[PDB]
Design a protein around this motif. Sequence first.
Motif, PDB file in Angstrom:
ATOM      1  N   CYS G   7       1.327   9.221   2.429  1.00  0.00           N
ATOM      2  CA  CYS G   7       0.442   8.550   3.068  1.00  0.00           C
ATOM      3  C   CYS G   7       0.487   8.334   4.657  1.00  0.00           C
ATOM      4  N   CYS G  10       1.132   4.162   6.334  1.00  0.00           N
ATOM      5  CA  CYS G  10       2.484   3.662   5.821  1.00  0.00           C
ATOM      6  C   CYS G  10       3.688   4.592   5.193  1.00  0.00           C
ATOM      7  N   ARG G  42      -2.001  -1.149  -1.858  1.00  0.00           N
ATOM      8  CA  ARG G  42      -2.625  -0.825  -0.456  1.00  0.00           C
ATOM      9  C   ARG G  42      -3.790   0.036  -0.405  1.00  0.00           C
ATOM     10  N   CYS G  44      -5.053   1.743   1.782  1.00  0.00           N
ATOM     11  CA  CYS G  44      -4.514   2.981   2.779  1.00  0.00           C
ATOM     12  C   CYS G  44      -4.109   4.049   2.003  1.00  0.00           C
ATOM     13  N   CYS G  45      -3.413   3.801   0.863  1.00  0.00           N
ATOM     14  CA  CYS G  45      -2.901   4.872  -0.065  1.00  0.00           C
ATOM     15  C   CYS G  45      -3.977   5.411  -0.934  1.00  0.00           C
TER      16      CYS G  45
HETATM   17 ZN   LIG Z   1      -0.621   3.839   2.716  1.00  0.00          ZN
END
Ligand SMILES: [Zn+2]
Lengths: 283, 54, 258, 48, 76, 94, 65, 152
Positions: G7, G10, G42, G44-45
């Motif tokens: 990712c 992160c 999260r 974001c993933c």
């Molecule tokens: Zn992430």
Amino acid sequence: NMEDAIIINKASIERGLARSTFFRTYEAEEKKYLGGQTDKFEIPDPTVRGYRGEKYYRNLDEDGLIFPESKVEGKDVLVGRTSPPRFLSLQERRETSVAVRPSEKGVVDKVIITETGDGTKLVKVTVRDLRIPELGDKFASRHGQKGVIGLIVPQEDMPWTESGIVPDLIVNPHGIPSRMTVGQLIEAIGGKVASLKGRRVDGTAFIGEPEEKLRKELEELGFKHTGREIMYDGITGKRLEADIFIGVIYYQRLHHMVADKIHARSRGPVQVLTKQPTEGRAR
Amino acid sequence: KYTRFEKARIIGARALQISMGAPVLIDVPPGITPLEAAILEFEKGVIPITVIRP
Amino acid sequence: GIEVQILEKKEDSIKFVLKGVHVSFANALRRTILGEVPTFAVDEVEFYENDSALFDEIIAHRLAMIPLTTPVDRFELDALELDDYTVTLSLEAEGPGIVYSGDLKSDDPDVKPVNPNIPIVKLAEGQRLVFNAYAKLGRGKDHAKWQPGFVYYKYYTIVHISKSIPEWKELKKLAKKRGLPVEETEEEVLVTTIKPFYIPKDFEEYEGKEIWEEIVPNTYIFTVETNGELPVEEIVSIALKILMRKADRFISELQKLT
Amino acid sequence: VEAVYRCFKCGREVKLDLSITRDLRCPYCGSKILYKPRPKVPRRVKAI
Amino acid sequence: AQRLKGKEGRFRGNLSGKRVNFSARTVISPDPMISINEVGVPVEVAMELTVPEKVTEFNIERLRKMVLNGPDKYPG
Amino acid sequence: MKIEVIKKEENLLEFYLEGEDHTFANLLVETLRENPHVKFTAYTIEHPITMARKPRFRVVTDGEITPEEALEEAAKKIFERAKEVLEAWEKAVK
Amino acid sequence: MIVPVRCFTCGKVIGDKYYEFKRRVEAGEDPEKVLDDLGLERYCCRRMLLSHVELIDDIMHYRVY
Amino acid sequence: PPYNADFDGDEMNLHVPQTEEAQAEARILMEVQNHIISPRYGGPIIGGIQDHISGGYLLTREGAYFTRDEVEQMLMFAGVDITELPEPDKYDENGNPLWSGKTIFSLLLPEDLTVWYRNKLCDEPERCEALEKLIEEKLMPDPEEVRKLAYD
RNA sequence: GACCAGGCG
Ligand SMILES: [Zn+2]
Ligand SMILES: [Mg+2]
Ligand SMILES: [Zn+2]
């Protein structure tokens, strides 16, 4: 990040974000002249006129063509060609090889040999170059907001939300009110909601999902309906005094890169008629 | 009393003179470009050039 | 005094409460873990023949992104000048199929890919791919490929809810549903903010006067997770040792000035 | 000066010399387009 | 007649304005950490454009040091 | 980590710290600010690009103690609580 | 072209769990439950897997030798 | 502002003078600090823009207060030559000293400046009239009286 | 070298 400038994370760049490759093709022809005179594909001898330094003819095969997947710098020779002598110089072939542009760099990708429509030989060579984002590169969303990268920041210096999210991009709040692009905020909220829910959001003009539904769904999922969060300063280590808007926004990388705009001249070729400096970055 | 055009012309003339062999009238730290030497001379008030005014 | 207690110790993630230190120390520990802890990673690839659909640089980057195991006892992972021991990895694949990350042969058995299921490239009939890769110790601050994990923290706060609010039971039920610990007393309901707790829209009128947040001084809730390169406790101990070594070197350099 | 070449659409090796050959054609296919194969040398690439 | 008139004629095209030698062009980016009378210059451009200097008794050492670096190290 | 002295006069000391960034500088100045004999102390990074690893420090003391011994005392305090935290963590992890 | 290994935001490794997600979402399961089961908390993933295109499979037909 | 430039893809040219006379002319006549005042209307052209005003309002608004570390860090970051902090203005709980924004901002002005006017944030004009009257009656009012009747 | 077309501020 003032005056339409943006700030990008470094670790995101190191992991493959907005990475791209540039191509370019060169062409050479073994032309036929009036009579028995003709060109030839050949590694030039040191005797011929206009013979460049022997360093440039470094990775040319004995047939006159460059080996694929070999590094090339500026002014390196791709195809070696020797023209017939120019009448006034007798018995002296002229060097007219095809060379990489003086301000480019890359790796040879493929070499093609073929024949034209009237019997002459023809070769085409492509050069592959890898380009990573840097200062001056132009990034732009689809809502009409454009800018260039102002600074690249290490990951540990960027702030982080208290739920564990680190921004991938920073945009100045001074640019929102003047342009009145509320669609960008709508898209940010919708994108965050879609990423949380595991399903894409429809935004087709006058039929797409209304804003209030998205806000209520975001409230249901656990976050705040205003879209704000609490972040901690990346240097001092304590939380800021104001909640910060944050979301997910689609972004595009334009092809106006800074590597194709830098130019500098001290002395060079001049016009024949007026003896003034020439025109163009290419020459 | 000098107008800024006169000051610029005087500084340019002295800077050109120094870079051709004329000795410096004041001590200067080493590595200083001639223009800075001319500027230092001017602000020290030891420049010998004068301007004629109709 | 300084003390530490654990809240959750799942397979590759540990959450603990750090108590009795200033904000600067916590931020320094977080930055040290993010940047200074070393780890093995690929640094250079030598290709013999590659006929896949991807260029050499893309395959090199994909190889560089694969995590690798790191032995703890053999090397000094807290020294300020790292060793240059080099581990070579080799591969040779041909024919149709997916070239998984589990087909890499390593000279040193202590350095192998953690997860043998990451795809690298897809090959068609008649294609080949042979190369050698070199890995070496590095630090996170130089490149992101050397990072061991991800760390963040937050304050330790208690939210007070007055029972004079006519529908406090909904807030209590929501807090229980989220999973936050709840303690109920007379004319007050106390919620511990182990995880973020955002007030809904309907109760935003009372916020500030009847719903207020209390911050416990000098207490933080950390969170560390790893990709399998190193155990978490080893990461924390190495970061603390690095901090101590930095302090000692600064002391020596300052002492030799006078 | 003899060199190896590969047909554009068949992929099978063609062996001829460009200096004196008057027409370029795979003896196996009517195509007149040929590639120049990569050499066998251990190219070295950084992993950044 | 056409060589002397228009926006590309000998008067407005070459005599009034002409191309110069020592110049450079590139994109701009913000930098608030420098004073208002300074400008940032890439090291690539700074190694191309040159400023002629006359050697005197107060700058012989620096000039001699610069010459030794050649045309490929920055101060040179 | 090299220490390069810029200006040294009376009770004032000002120096660079080559090979360091915010991580150690902020901790050092925060530790220093607890001393009751330090009148003024701060740090900054002059330019994030060219001098990202050369923080500039300013330490001004009352005069009861010299700046150098105040710096040494502040640096000694970190080595103590860091070790204490390490001991507590190693005791608690098992 | 192909699924990224880590990712972007992160650095968590998600490159080995795309095919399972695709198969279980093509089998009629709830995407949110599948993503929760895979361990991606999260968003974001989740953004990485939810918005990927497998463009490698339709470019191998063209070979350059 | 004088260049009318914006960082969204703009480009600029750079020229290098070669002769000493040209360098002297550029150094004496063409310096940036010599063109702060615009010749068109006799007013400043180079000045603050965008955040330089919002940050100033955030610093100098009513009720703004800062701790010791923030004050020291901002003063060091700005480049001000200071070796002793002024007297604290008010004490928080647990006796933490606090400094106001106006006190911090006053450290940049010259020592003998004096001026007064009205800015854009004037909403009620019946409160500035009292301050103008107080200034008019006594040309140098007691600072306590002015601080008691402050207004944005 | 001159024309034509398309972009950038
Ligand atoms: Zn992430
Ligand atoms: Mg513009
Ligand atoms: Zn064929």
